[PDB]
Amino acid sequence: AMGSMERASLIQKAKLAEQAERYEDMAAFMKGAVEKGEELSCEERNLLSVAYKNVVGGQRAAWRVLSSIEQKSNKGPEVREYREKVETELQGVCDTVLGLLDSHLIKEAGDAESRVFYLKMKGDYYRYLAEVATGDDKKRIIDSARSAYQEAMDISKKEMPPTNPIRLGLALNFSVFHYEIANSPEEAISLAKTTFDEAMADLHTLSEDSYKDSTLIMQLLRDNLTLWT
Amino acid sequence: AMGSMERASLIQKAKLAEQAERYEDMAAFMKGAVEKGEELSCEERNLLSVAYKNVVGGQRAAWRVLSSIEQKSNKGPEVREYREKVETELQGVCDTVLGLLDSHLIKEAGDAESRVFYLKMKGDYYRYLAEVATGDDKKRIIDSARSAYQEAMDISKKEMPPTNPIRLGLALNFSVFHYEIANSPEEAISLAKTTFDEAMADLHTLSEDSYKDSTLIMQLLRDNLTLWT
Ligand SMILES: O=C(COc1ccccc1P(=O)(O)O)Nc1ccccc1C(F)(F)F
Ligand SMILES: O=C(COc1ccccc1P(=O)(O)O)Nc1ccccc1C(F)(F)F
Ligand SMILES: [Cl-]
Ligand SMILES: [Cl-]
Ligand SMILES: [Cl-]
Ligand SMILES: [Cl-]
Ligand SMILES: [Cl-]
Ligand SMILES: [Cl-]
Ligand SMILES: [Mg+2]
Ligand SMILES: [Mg+2]
Ligand SMILES: [Mg+2]
Ligand SMILES: [Mg+2]
């Protein structure tokens, strides 16, 4: 439905929707902006990520509540029906995001900051699909997440400093993938610890403001290391 | 869309949606339950009110953010367009609730607790329509709210004790109508003070649990009196 609205107007309205905490509207505005076909700036990529992370975050929290109730019941079919409703809507949001990345955000992303950002997003949305998947459809979804994260890591290590916040956040989320999805707690701890230590050694190169940006994410790595060790 | 689902299943799913904080789904489930045509029990009326109050509360908060931004701008048409979008969706939610009350909740409500509950709801949803109305369409909406609240007050004073929580909450919201909508701060303060004092004198009749229920709402009356005097 956003075909008739100006790209600039879509971006302006996404920012208004963020201020209003209207994240479903924010995501529809930013989907419309992506579908204009032009590449996104750094600000715009962040608007797209904030919108969908808040939409899928609501869905994941609801799915977890319903799944817990369903497991405790294991009356009639209603808890399973409603958990399946919420699950299908969550899957649809992830498939929307993955579709924007495949048509055609990733293929036109040539700079490291854009290409790593999009491949991290592809890892994250396959990861949310894996959280609700079962069996051996689940295996192929987990491998799709792994592959996207790994391509993003390879580029980030070649092209960005170890304190770059997108590099840091990629490594944080890939560590969470290993601990929560891939049953690989030692890989998770290794990655979080190596990433924290390599960033610490590069902090001296940063301005006050960059230092604030990087140490924020480093603290998240440390918080996880504390939960996991 | 809820015509094929059992009434009991709709109520069960509304309670699951409340636990999941999925208030739009909760409201659609309870609209479906109302549209079965049977009267609602006390528990069910509370589920219907909780669902819509959370849906319209999100819309009112967003509308206030957008309206404030629009007033500060007074660029191009986008802030007005998006405030109008949110306003129209808010109006639609209120028109849905008012339609359920008119078809046919109020006309079949013969007991005081049900009839006062529904007429309070009719007052509240016309009040939310008045918050976004302008001019002299606004006057007729304000009079619709007034009339519903007044019918509810007349029945509550004849039929319920002064500590009854629905009577208390009606009086609290009618006081807010007078202060925020009708430009009648003295009527608001008079009503809140008379309602608080009449409840205080009846507390001695209550059990521990009823006393907790009533004094909760009395504290809201006192909190408003503090803001207004
Ligand atoms: O509690 C968490 C913490 O998750 C992470 C921690 C570190 C890095 C990435 C993530 P990710 O799994 O990408 O969010 N997430 C969550 C789970 C369910 C619902 C809503 C949310 C949210 F709102 F995001 F918090
Ligand atoms: O801040 C308030 C306090 O309003 C009242 C106080 C006393 C009696 C009735 C109300 P009412 O005006 O019926 O809610 N409401 C509000 C306003 C905007 C958005 C969301 C909300 C909500 F979530 F309800 F808090
Ligand atoms: Cl369902
Ligand atoms: Cl390219
Ligand atoms: Cl620990
Ligand atoms: Cl709009
Ligand atoms: Cl009747
Ligand atoms: Cl005061
Ligand atoms: Mg154009
Ligand atoms: Mg390019
Ligand atoms: Mg039946
Ligand atoms: Mg009846």
Report the distance separating Cα B88 and Cα A35, nearest Å: 26
Report the distance separating Cα B133 and Cα B120, nearest Å: 20
Report the distance separating Cα B189 and Cα B225, nearest Å: 6
Sequence-ordered strand ranges (E) for B64-208: none
* Main-chain phi, psi angles of B201, to 5 degrees: -70, -15
* Main-chain phi, psi angles of A26, to 5 degrees: -60, -45
Report the distance separating Cα B18 and Cα B44, nearest Å: 12
Q: Which one of A23, A52, A59, A60 would you pick to mutate in the ligand 1 pocket, going by the greatest count of ligand atoms within 8 A of its CB?
A: A60
* Residue A153 burial by Cβ neighbours in a 10 Å radius (0-12, 13-18, 19+): buried
Report the distance separating Cα A98 and Cα A120, nearest Å: 11
Residue nearest to atom 3 of ligand 1 (CA): A176
Domains of chain A: 1-229 (1.20.190.20)
Q: Chain A contacts of B62, Cβ < 8 Å?
A: 20-22
Question: Hey, what's the torsion of the CAs at B29, A83, A60, A28, to 10 degrees?
Answer: -50
* Residue A198 burial by Cβ neighbours in a 10 Å radius (0-12, 13-18, 19+): middle
Q: What is the resolution of this structure in A?
A: 1.6
Helix axes B135-159, B165-180, angle to 10 degrees: 150
* Residue A70 burial by Cβ neighbours in a 10 Å radius (0-12, 13-18, 19+): middle
At A66 the three-state DSSP class reads: helix
Closest residue in A to B62 (Cα–Cα): A20
Nearest Cα residue to A227 out of A173, A188, A198: A188
Q: Which residues 6+ apart lie within 8 Å of A46 measured at CB?
A: none
Asked if A215 contacts A165 with a C-beta cutoff of 8 angstroms, the reply is no
Cα–Cα distances (Å) from B121 to A108, B95, B100, in that order, read 53, 12, 11
Report the distance separating Cα A169 and Cα A190, nearest Å: 15
Determine the distance from the C-alpha atom of residue A57 to the mean position of all C-alpha atoms in its chain, rounded to a whole number. 10
A10 to chain B, any CB pair closer than 8 A? The answer is: no
Question: Hey, what's the torsion of the CAs at A51, A55, A61, A64, to 10 degrees?
Answer: -130
| Ramachandran quadrant class, B164 (left: phi over 0; alpha: psi -120 to 50; beta: rest) | beta
Handedness of CA B60, B62, B66, B71 (dihedral sign): positive
Q: Which residue has the tokens 């109520």?
A: B11
CA angle A98, A85, A120 (to 5 degrees): 20
Report the distance separating Cα B123 and Cα B170, nearest Å: 9
Report the distance separating Cα A113 and Cα A103, nearest Å: 19
At A181 the three-state DSSP class reads: coil
Q: Which residue has the tokens 């009040």?
A: B127
Cβ–Cβ gap B81/A17 under 8 Å: no
A70 to chain B, any CB pair closer than 8 A? The answer is: no
Cα–Cα distances (Å) from A40 to A6, A35, A119, in that order, read 15, 11, 14
Cα–Cα distances (Å) from A196 to A158, A169, A208, B10, in that order, read 17, 11, 18, 50
Q: How is residue A45 written in tokens?
A: 């990529």
Asked if A175 contacts A224 with a C-beta cutoff of 8 angstroms, the reply is yes
Cα–Cα distances (Å) from B144 to A141, A186, B119, B147, B212, in that order, read 56, 65, 11, 5, 33
Q: How is residue A39 written in tokens?
A: 């590449």
Indicate the residue type of A215.
T
Report the distance separating Cα A212 and Cα A218, nearest Å: 10
